[PDB]
Write a protein that binds this DNA or RNA. Sequence first.
RNA 1: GUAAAGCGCACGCAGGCGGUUUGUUAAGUCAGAUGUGAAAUCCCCGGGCUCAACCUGGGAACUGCAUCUGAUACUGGCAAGCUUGAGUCUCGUAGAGGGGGGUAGAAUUCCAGGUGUAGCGGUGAAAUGCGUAGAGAUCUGGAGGAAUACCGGUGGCGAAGGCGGCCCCCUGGACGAAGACUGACGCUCAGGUGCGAAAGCGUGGGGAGCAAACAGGAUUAGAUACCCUGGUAGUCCACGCCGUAAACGAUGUCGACUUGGAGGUUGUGCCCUUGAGGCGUGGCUUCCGGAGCUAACGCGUUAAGUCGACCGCCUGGGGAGUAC
Lengths: 18, 129, 218, 88
Amino acid sequence: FYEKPTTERKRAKASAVK
Amino acid sequence: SMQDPIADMLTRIRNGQAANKAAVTMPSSKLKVAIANVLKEEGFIEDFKVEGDTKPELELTLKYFQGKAVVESIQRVSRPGLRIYKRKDELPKVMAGLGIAVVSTSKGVMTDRAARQAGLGGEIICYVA
Amino acid sequence: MLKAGVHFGHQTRYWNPKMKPFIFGARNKVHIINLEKTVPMFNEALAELNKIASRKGKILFVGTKRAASEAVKDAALSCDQFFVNHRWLGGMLTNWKTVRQSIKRLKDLETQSQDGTFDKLTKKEALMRTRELEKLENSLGGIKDMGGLPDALFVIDADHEHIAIKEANNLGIPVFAIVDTNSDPDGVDFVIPGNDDAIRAVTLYLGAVAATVREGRS
Amino acid sequence: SLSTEATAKIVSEFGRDANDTGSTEVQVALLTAQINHLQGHFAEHKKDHHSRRGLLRMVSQRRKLLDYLKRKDVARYTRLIERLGLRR
RNA sequence: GUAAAGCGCACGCAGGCGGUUUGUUAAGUCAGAUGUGAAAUCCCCGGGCUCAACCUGGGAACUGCAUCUGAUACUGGCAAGCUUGAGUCUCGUAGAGGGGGGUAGAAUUCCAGGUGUAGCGGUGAAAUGCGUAGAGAUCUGGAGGAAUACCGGUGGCGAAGGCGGCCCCCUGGACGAAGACUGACGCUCAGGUGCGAAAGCGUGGGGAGCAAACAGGAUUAGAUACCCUGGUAGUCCACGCCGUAAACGAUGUCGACUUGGAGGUUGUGCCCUUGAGGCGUGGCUUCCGGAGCUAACGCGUUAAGUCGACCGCCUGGGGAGUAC
């Protein structure tokens, strides 16, 4: 994506952090 | 503060009193101490003492008669950026006289009770209340 | 040397800075209460409890926590007085008319539930109601005597029942708390920087309070 | 850039004594030594914009110290900017 | 912040503000005084019209200006300092901070070779396509261009845009340990200058994939779209331009003050560092949360709290970020 993957890896840190 | 060393002390006095501190410290001045006398003798605060030579730091010992603070709201009026000067008759009254103002009169810094008795207006340092 | 010089503290690191001054300073990763400074608001609370008992104090012994529960029911009885050795039922102060009818219901249980099982309609169904609403009377064990509106309050903690103080101050009843150090002492009335755990300690506190209230009538 | 001895000589002759790094003429001439060095860099690259920010920062601080010389003590100003050729 | 509204970000002239002590001046300021502020209007105490409107006496008022004489706290000037503001040096610590050079290997593609073979691909089924020649598949090599798997992170750096292979050359900041040195050298900044993702343009190269446009095949009621097969500009490089973005933390910069907890990253001081660290201290940083603030969500020592100095902008929706 060149701009999503830094967003999902900085969103799903809402998914898979706790 | 970097451009208003007196609104800075007033902010000290009414930040360190929401937090309910007994005493506050700041780098002193001659005008800061001139104010501190007028505050501490109208009973708005216990007593102070200045100390230091290279860095003479003013420390006021704040007062409060309950959980409530005796100093309700001090307001910096003559801001550098809008300097406010009054005459001997247009001197502000604070809460219709219940609270105190601090002005710089030609015979020094004092309240407005006394600088209105003295017939000599000044430079409105701050409303004390 | 006494109780104060026996119980030390609580609150490893999750501390509440509203009661900042009450601690000497943490040692061994736990906070230590200014134990010596606790007796000036021991004896003052003791004296006022004596005065309230002189006015026939209507005083609560809130004992919601596990261990103090029977450890306080014994007290109120030795205090000839009230307690809540169980959960603080939500609103036992503000919702008083509700528990007013509830204690009417419980007095009905202790008067006519005996009478109902006698001959009224059934044997077995009335027995079921007995064995169930005996649990209701097991609830509300302390308050059950008088018309309500107690004079003052002697809760044994703050955080576990912040709702209790939140109701008594909203109504204007003097909370004679024994704050933990984890707690939130802004709401209480006559805060006591004690330690709420170490059941030995709370037994000592309540024994002193009982000694005061049993003859506060002078 | 500039070396330790290269700054040491500047502090030496332009300071009123050894270890007078702080006097404004020492700072001025040390900054201008560095600027004169870096013109040779920035004539080579011309696409290094994340260093002309630093070059501009020190040219701006050099002008700001120079104006302070001008007000505070004119004689040192007018004796320095010809020892440097400065204030073209 | 989300309602309209923080310039994309810096640097900076003019401008606006300015720590602290003493001396001086007395411009601002303040007090008093003297003139003057036309009359009428306005207000006050009256008076005369049978009352009133109306007329009218005297006062007050005209919040101003100029001159003079005092004060000197605060603001300004001039002079002398001071060290806390700001900056230089000694010293190390970290880093995808830049710019210029090479360099490696995988991976797509293409080409040459060998083996041998009828399908390959493609999707929700399909043809176009590629192929019996030797395709796909396999290993052997060779050319080229473009990006750097793993580490990798709620990580790090940068004024923003942005910056990830490795190594060197030049360089820019930042932070921390003690020190030393200047003495207010400061903050903000209309105009101004410079950087400015991606597209896009200009002149010459390059061009592996990818691919607006364009072709051909399905879909659908229709398909100029999604979908497939090709595919040009562009994407890459140098120089020049463009100047924009949901350029966003939708939070301007700077400073001071104001309960706590848990992490992260990078220095450092002391402690048996025994060590991992414990006790502390810095910086940057993510997440909770009462005070307080908010319409609210929410912010909450990195504030949207309590103040100060400057700058930019807002003023119902559309028309319109449009015409000129």
